[PDB]
Design an enzyme around this catalytic site. Structure first.
Site, short mmCIF file in Angstrom:
data_model
loop_
_atom_site.label_atom_id
_atom_site.label_comp_id
_atom_site.label_asym_id
_atom_site.label_seq_id
_atom_site.Cartn_x
_atom_site.Cartn_y
_atom_site.Cartn_z
N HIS A 18 0.84 -1.34 0.48
CA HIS A 18 0.37 0.45 0.17
C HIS A 18 0.80 1.17 0.10
O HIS A 18 1.91 1.12 0.40
CB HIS A 18 -0.30 -0.05 1.24
CG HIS A 18 -1.64 1.12 1.23
ND1 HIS A 18 -2.24 1.41 -0.45
CD2 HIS A 18 -1.97 2.18 2.11
CE1 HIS A 18 -3.24 2.58 0.51
NE2 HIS A 18 -3.22 2.96 1.63
N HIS A 30 -3.95 9.58 1.29
CA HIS A 30 -3.67 8.38 0.93
C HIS A 30 -5.22 8.06 0.46
O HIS A 30 -6.17 8.22 0.28
CB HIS A 30 -3.16 7.27 1.53
CG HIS A 30 -4.41 6.08 2.86
ND1 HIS A 30 -4.30 4.72 2.79
CD2 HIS A 30 -5.16 7.05 3.68
CE1 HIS A 30 -5.11 4.43 3.49
NE2 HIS A 30 -5.88 6.20 4.26
N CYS A 90 -2.69 3.16 -6.44
CA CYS A 90 -2.58 3.98 -5.15
C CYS A 90 -0.68 4.66 -5.08
O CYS A 90 -1.05 5.98 -4.76
CB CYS A 90 -2.48 2.90 -3.64
SG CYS A 90 -4.33 2.84 -3.40
#
Length: 102
Positions: A18, A30, A90
């Site tokens: 992540h 995020h 991401c």
């Protein structure tokens, strides 16, 4: 140690990475699920997972002024992103914030 504002954070979740962007005072911006742009504590985002600062492309690309990185990151907080969540997406999101679009 503590990240600097604007630093890209690589989170080693089991079987997937992540990404987040540090915005200061314990906070990361995020992409998460309800994709929503979120401001959260790094402590909470990391959880029990290992993580590292990875300003990967600083060798080849100029980071933006760090004031611009934080401003931009925090502007998007609350906004849905039309693309889905993968590590690549991401990662591209936090990269767009640090380096710009290109």
């Amino acid at each position: 140690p503590e990240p600097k504002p604007g630093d890209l954070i690589e989170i080693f979740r089991p079987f997937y990475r992540h990404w987040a962007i540090y915005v200061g005072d314990g906070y990361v911006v995020h992409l998460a699920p309800p994709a929503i742009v979120k401001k959260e504590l790094l402590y909470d985002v990391a959880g029990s997972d290992k993580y590292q600062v990875n300003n990967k492309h600083d060798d080849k690309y100029s980071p933006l002024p760090c004031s611009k990185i934080i401003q931009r990151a925090e502007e998007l907080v609350g906004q849905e992103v039309l693309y889905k969540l993968t590590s690549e997406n991401c990662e591209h999101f936090v990269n767009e914030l640090r380096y710009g679009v290109a």
